């Protein structure tokens, strides 16, 4: 007597979304000039990693970036001189994510251990030491990023997310809406909302202040691995294992564009937009990265520089270059 | 020429590289294994028999030394039922030590399904699996009791015959030997169907009290190292 109400409400929501489907993104953008062949070249090659690279994150200054390597060491890489700035030893070797504070003073990291540790980089001691340890989760941390110098979001594998306070280190806000293991999350530019994708073929939008899920997007056929926010702050792309990328708009509450190909039978690992958002770089398991057009849904460029599974892909704040990291323990800068 | 801060940056980079050299040396000098097993298997006894802070820890590390070689075994801690995502983090491990209870005939099918899933994984197709059939004395007692039959759960047990290459232990009932060899065969039929020479399985029989598993693990790691050295050099 309870499931019938839920299913009829879901059918009503589906009918309401279908009624608002006036046209498609490809139909409106069918008479525009294409982007042509977007060919990028390797400018800098970062060597020094020991184990396979799992994640990376750029900085607000577009100069220094952080990367995560499973050998138990975090290296701060320079995009200009390719020199190693800091070497942070990790207590846990199985790392899966890394973050960089907007002010450039703290760096996050996590993995199989249920702790998204924060390490300081501008302390008076000069070296790097353990700054804070956020314990309390019951699952592996997939990705934890920074929002400010006071709060920090953490996405764990226990189907729950948690916004912690840096000063107190306790659970300030909780999110228990997801049913699968939270795989990725992307923050909004206004630092007020964030879209999280889990192992349920669906994404959910949450608020940092309200602490409740307002929008839920479905349509995928497998688990979503990565998710990135659009520069305008109204849409977001999600890639899954079904070799298809789906663009969902917050203000429209419906899928806009679907990127797929017949020769692509591998899952998406990382997605990220440029400064304008016209080109979407998606990493696949076929050792190559594909550049899709946000308006034409056409393959703009192919990156075949890595010889292993592409793990992380990050675009700078100004869109000057793209840093790609794979299991081959090499970070490559493309421009 | 370079500036004043560029020299200090180059010196810092060279120091970090010299430190990463020793880090890589220590990393390659130590082997890493992935310990897996159900709750009924009883891997706690295997962990506690190995000799050299938060309660919500999801991964435990046990470091020991065998034949002057360091081995760090990793055991899964507080993790949920889904194990398809984080398993990809163990792509560069040396071996996967999978423990199976033999005295529980009801979960033998689940153990075989888990072994098939691990062996046929896209990212685990190049990693060797070491099978530890724990609780041999309990299986022997259950077979000598006779209160439960094996053919009710596996019809192939009614048609399986003891191979000529068997090595019966001194003072052991032939029925227990036939049962354990049938279990070994059932476990190896999955590893031999998708082996293709890139990886192999190491079947071993572990009892309750055993102080020789360390040497077996060391020999298996040495064999895996020999195989990967032969494969990377193309002598293979």
């Amino acid at each position, epitope marked *: 007597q309870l499931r019938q109400e839920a299913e009829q409400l879901k059918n009503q929501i589906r009918d309401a979304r279908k009624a608002c489907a006036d046209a498609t993104l490809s139909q409106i953008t069918n008479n525009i000039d294409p982007v042509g062949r977007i060919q990028m070249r390797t400018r800098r090659t970062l060597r020094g990693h020991l184990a396979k690279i799992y994640a990376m994150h750029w900085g607000t200054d577009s100069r220094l970036l952080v990367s995560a390597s499973q050998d138990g060491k975090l290296i701060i890489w320079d995009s200009y001189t390719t020199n190693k700035v800091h070497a942070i030893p990790l207590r846990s070797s199985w790392v899966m994510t890394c973050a960089y504070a907007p002010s450039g003073n703290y760096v996050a990291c996590g993995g199989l251990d249920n702790i998204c540790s924060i390490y300081n980089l501008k302390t008076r001691e000069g070296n790097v030491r353990v700054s804070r340890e956020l314990a309390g989760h019951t699952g592996y941390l997939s990705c934890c990023r920074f929002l400010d110098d006071n709060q920090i979001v953490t996405s764990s594998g226990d*189907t729950t997310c948690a916004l912690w306070d840096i000063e107190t280190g306790q659970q300030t806000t909780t999110f228990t809406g997801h049913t699968g293991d939270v795989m990725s999350l992307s923050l909004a530019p206004d630092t007020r909302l964030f879209v999280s994708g889990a192992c349920d073929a669906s994404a959910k939008l949450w608020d940092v202040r309200e602490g409740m899920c307002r929008q839920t997007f479905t349509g995928h056929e497998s688990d979503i691995n990565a998710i990135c926010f659009f520069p305008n702050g109204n849409a977001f792309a999600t890639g899954s294992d079904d070799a298809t990328c789906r663009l969902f708009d917050l203000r429209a509450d419906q899928e806009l564009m679907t990127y797929s190909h017949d020769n692509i039978i591998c899952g998406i690992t990382s997605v990220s937009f440029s400064k304008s958002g016209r080109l979407l770089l998606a990493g696949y398991d076929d050792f190559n990265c594909n550049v899709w057009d946000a308006l034409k849904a056409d393959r703009a460029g192919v990156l075949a520089g890595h010889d292993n599974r592409v793990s992380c892909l990050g675009v700078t704040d100004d869109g000057m270059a793209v840093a790609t990291g794979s299991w081959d323990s090499f970070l490559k800068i493309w421009n | 020429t370079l500036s004043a801060e560029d020299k200090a940056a180059v010196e810092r980079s060279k120091m970090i590289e010299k430190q990463l050299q020793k880090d890589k040396q220590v990393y390659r000098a130590t082997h890493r294994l992935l310990l897996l097993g159900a709750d009924n298997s009883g891997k706690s006894t295997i962990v506690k028999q190995m000799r050299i802070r938060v309660k919500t820890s999801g991964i435990f590390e046990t470091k020991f030394q065998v034949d002057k070689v360091n081995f760090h075994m990793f055991d899964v801690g507080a993790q949920r039922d*889904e194990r398809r995502k984080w398993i990809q983090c163990f792509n560069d491990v040396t071996a996967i030590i999978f423990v199976v209870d033999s005295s529980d005939y009801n979960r033998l*099918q689940e153990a075989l399904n888990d072994f098939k899933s691990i062996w046929n994984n896209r990212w685990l197709r190049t990693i060797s699996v070491i099978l530890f059939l724990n609780k041999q004395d309990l299986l022997a007692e259950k077979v000598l009791a006779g209160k439960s039959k094996i053919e009710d759960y596996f019809p192939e047990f009614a048609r399986y015959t003891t191979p000529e290459d068997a090595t019966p232990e001194p003072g052991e009932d032939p029925r227990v030997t036939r049962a354990k060899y049938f279990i070994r065969d059932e476990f190896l039929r999955i590893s031999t169907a998708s082996g293709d020479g890139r990886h192999y399985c190491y079947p071993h029989f572990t009892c309750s009290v055993d102080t020789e598993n360390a040497r077996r693990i060391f020999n298996d790691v040495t064999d895996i190292i020999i195989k990967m050295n032969l494969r990377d050099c193309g002598l293979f």
Partner: nanobody
Amino acid sequence: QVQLQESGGGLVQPGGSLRLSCAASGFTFSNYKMNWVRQAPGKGLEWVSDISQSGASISYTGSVKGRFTISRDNAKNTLYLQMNSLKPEDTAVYYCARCPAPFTRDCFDVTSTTYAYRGQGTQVT
């Protein structure tokens, strides 16, 4: 959206035959591996049958081997299961699971308690 609707159960005396039908919606039926599992009162999830995409690779468990027959229908995206010679110990809830990654041979999370790509199951007594 992923949707799996199972039907064809009911109460039947031991020795009869049943025809379970599973309909899939929201994904490609021919590009994923399918599994049938069972859950009995007082015990956990137990795997029963597995069938690949093309229907060539078919496997059953030793407990019900020889009696159950699983088949696919790509023209309507349906999964049929004929159960003959039902034993009195077959009173359980049957569930249908789908592999997470397409074009893969892995069989992970098919016996997990929390799984999104799984129907509601049908009772067989």
